[PDB]
Design an enzyme around this catalytic site. Sequence first.
Site, PDB file in Angstrom:
ATOM      1  CD  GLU A  12      -2.711  -1.296  -0.030  1.00 45.77           C
ATOM      2  OE1 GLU A  12      -2.968  -0.121  -0.929  1.00 45.77           O
ATOM      3  OE2 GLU A  12      -3.048  -2.236  -0.584  1.00 45.77           O
ATOM      4  CB  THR A  17      -0.436   5.892  -7.315  1.00 46.65           C
ATOM      5  OG1 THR A  17      -1.515   5.198  -6.710  1.00 46.65           O
ATOM      6  CG2 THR A  17      -0.777   7.117  -8.044  1.00 46.65           C
ATOM      7  NE  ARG A 147       5.496 -11.402 -23.558  1.00 45.81           N
ATOM      8  CZ  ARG A 147       6.269 -10.057 -23.775  1.00 45.81           C
ATOM      9  NH1 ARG A 147       6.162  -9.204 -23.072  1.00 45.81           N
ATOM     10  NH2 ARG A 147       6.903  -9.973 -24.839  1.00 45.81           N
ATOM     11  CG  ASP A 169       4.648  -1.346  -9.590  1.00 44.76           C
ATOM     12  OD1 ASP A 169       5.185  -0.793  -8.518  1.00 44.76           O
ATOM     13  OD2 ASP A 169       3.345  -1.587  -9.465  1.00 44.76           O
ATOM     14  CD  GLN A 173       0.653  -9.129  -2.369  1.00 49.29           C
ATOM     15  OE1 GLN A 173      -0.188  -9.384  -1.458  1.00 49.29           O
ATOM     16  NE2 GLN A 173       0.519  -9.413  -3.469  1.00 49.29           N
TER      17      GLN A 173
END
EC number: 3.6.5.-
Length: 323
Positions: A12, A17, A147, A169, A173
């Site tokens: 988070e 973003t 993909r 990215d 987690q």
Amino acid sequence: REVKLLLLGAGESGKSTIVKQMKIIHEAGYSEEECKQYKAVVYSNTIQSIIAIIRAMGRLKIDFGDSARADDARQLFVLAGAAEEGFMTAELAGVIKRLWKDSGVQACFNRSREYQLNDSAAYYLNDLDRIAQPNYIPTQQDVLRTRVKTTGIVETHFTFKDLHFKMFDVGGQRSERKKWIHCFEGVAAIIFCVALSDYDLVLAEDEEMNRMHESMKLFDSICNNKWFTDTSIILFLNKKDLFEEKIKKSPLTICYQEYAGSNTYEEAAAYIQCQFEDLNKRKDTKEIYTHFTCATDTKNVQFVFDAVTDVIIKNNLKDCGLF
């Protein structure tokens, strides 16, 4: 020219973003002949995406917002066949537009965490017009977006200050964190997103856990890492914007009980940037390169990015530093 920023951070942290922001502030692509080969793949996955958002409306009760959305949906299965060919008649184009715009289909995509969504399903539909254009060529980004799920590492290209970046990215987690080594190669500089607001929130990984304390731990593993000594480290205190609000009610003491400071955005957010930089084993010879940021605000990610890029130039260059 190759920078290749990595996106590290606790869950988070908002790293996702930051990825979309590059599509806006930056726009680049240079491989037109190669892109045309992909063109079938782009139109293909896009139809696969909205079809996911549609069928989810069933298994989760969700009506279309407008009654008109009926029939457009049924049409999508028909025209979609041409999309497999890599062709996109305008009729196929607008029909998709009516669906994604729908007040009710949006009810699903917010829900998307439950049903599987295509990895790019947002990035495609959001730019559906540009792909629709006659004899469209995919952007170099469009090729990477291709993909089925598998790599687990989103790619994002964009050229800032005439240098090609390749942001990578990776999910914050803990389950995703083991994947991170795949991106370690060739990195110029890390951006380590961290949500300042997390100071009260608990991890999904463990409700007992403080999310912020978790950030302090893995962050130490990275900055200290011998592999990264060559690479610049750059902290990115994400979500400085919502943090100035929530601090007004909630005490910072919810994370660092020792804290005395005022409930101000300055003393509060800044206090973390103290505890973080303190982790460094090598304050003598390593600069944290901290920067407060707001991924939600395109205006703020932009001017900040201009600064961070300069450090990458004067510091990083030529085959990961040496020659």
